[PDB]
Amino acid sequence: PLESQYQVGPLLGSGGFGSVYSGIRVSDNLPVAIKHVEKDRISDWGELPNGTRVPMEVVLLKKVSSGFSGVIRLLDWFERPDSFVLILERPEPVQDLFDFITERGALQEELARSFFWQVLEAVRHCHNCGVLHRDIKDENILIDLNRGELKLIDFGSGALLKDTVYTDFDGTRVYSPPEWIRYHRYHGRSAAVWSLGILLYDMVCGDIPFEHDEEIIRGQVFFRQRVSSECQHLIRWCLALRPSDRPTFEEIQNHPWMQDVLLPQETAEIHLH
Numbered sequence: 001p002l003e004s005q006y007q008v009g010p011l012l013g014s015g016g017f018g019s020v021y022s023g024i025r026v027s028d029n030l031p032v033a034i035k036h037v038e039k040d041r042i043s044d045w046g047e048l049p050n051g052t053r054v055p056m057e058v059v060l061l062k063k064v065s066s067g068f069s070g071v072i073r074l075l076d077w078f079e080r081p082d083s084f085v086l087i088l089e090r091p092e093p094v095q096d097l098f099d100f101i102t103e104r105g106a107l108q109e110e111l112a113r114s115f116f117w118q119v120l121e122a123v124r125h126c127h128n129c130g131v132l133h134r135d136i137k138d139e140n141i142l143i144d145l146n147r148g149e150l151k152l153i154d155f156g157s158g159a160l161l162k163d164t165v166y167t168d169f170d171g172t173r174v175y176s177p178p179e180w181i182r183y184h185r186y187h188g189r190s191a192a193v194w195s196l197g198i199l200l201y202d203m204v205c206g207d208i209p210f211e212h213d214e215e216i217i218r219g220q221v222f223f224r225q226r227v228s229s230e231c232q233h234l235i236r237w238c239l240a241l242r243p244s245d246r247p248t249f250e251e252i253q254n255h256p257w258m259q260d261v262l263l264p265q266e267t268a269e270i271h272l273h
Ligand SMILES: COc1ccc2c(c1)[nH]c(=O)c1sc3ccccc3c12
Pocket: 012, 013, 014, 020, 032, 033, 035, 072, 088, 089, 090, 091, 094, 153, 154
């Protein structure tokens, strides 16, 4: 049982998704996180390669939890009467990027360069694993503060990766690409590039670039902060209106602004310790 094996601590979070508690694995005092989700409110189910019929979040988690990555891993899970319970990695100490930016404002370019890279590597990882995240934002990124290592969370909005069009999107409005606003159609990769464009803006500007639909389809970014002529390029390109004009992950990662990335410890040394 879940109540036997894991010492429940405080509650870290609540919402549309569910409820998430800090927790300790008794069997060796390993930090964990315990996410509970009512079956009642589960929007999108799936079946795992054992047959068993679980929520989609669980399948995806299994797929990406091969080897090491910047993806919060699944360690375990339990079904109950009216809920499923998920044991995830908990790093210690840890703060999510939405809090981090809210607290500390616009990030220095060197720091944003590290974090973005890290996110790109992680998203690449997911795509190799057949998984599309679909809600890529500050709130879904945790920063292990000692290692300076970014880790990806929440696959509630996620899906299997595919090359044909997508026609639902239970992720956030402001981060929604204009092809979805206008047509209720998009493709995973290109739209992922769109949300990464919004993410990079947030990092370097302290706030997201578009508040309303009209601004999004406008497709026009005013920098409120001093940003390098090079970063502005890469942001504007990720936020190109026609998706086919947006870069690929490779093109992002060879863009001049993404040169000389600090590694995670170095990043923490300078910017977090
Ligand atoms: C305030 O909203 C939160 C806050 C936190 C989480 C969260 C949502 N969703 C998660 O899947 C996880 S996993 C994890 C692991 C360690 C620490 C936090 C989390 C969260």
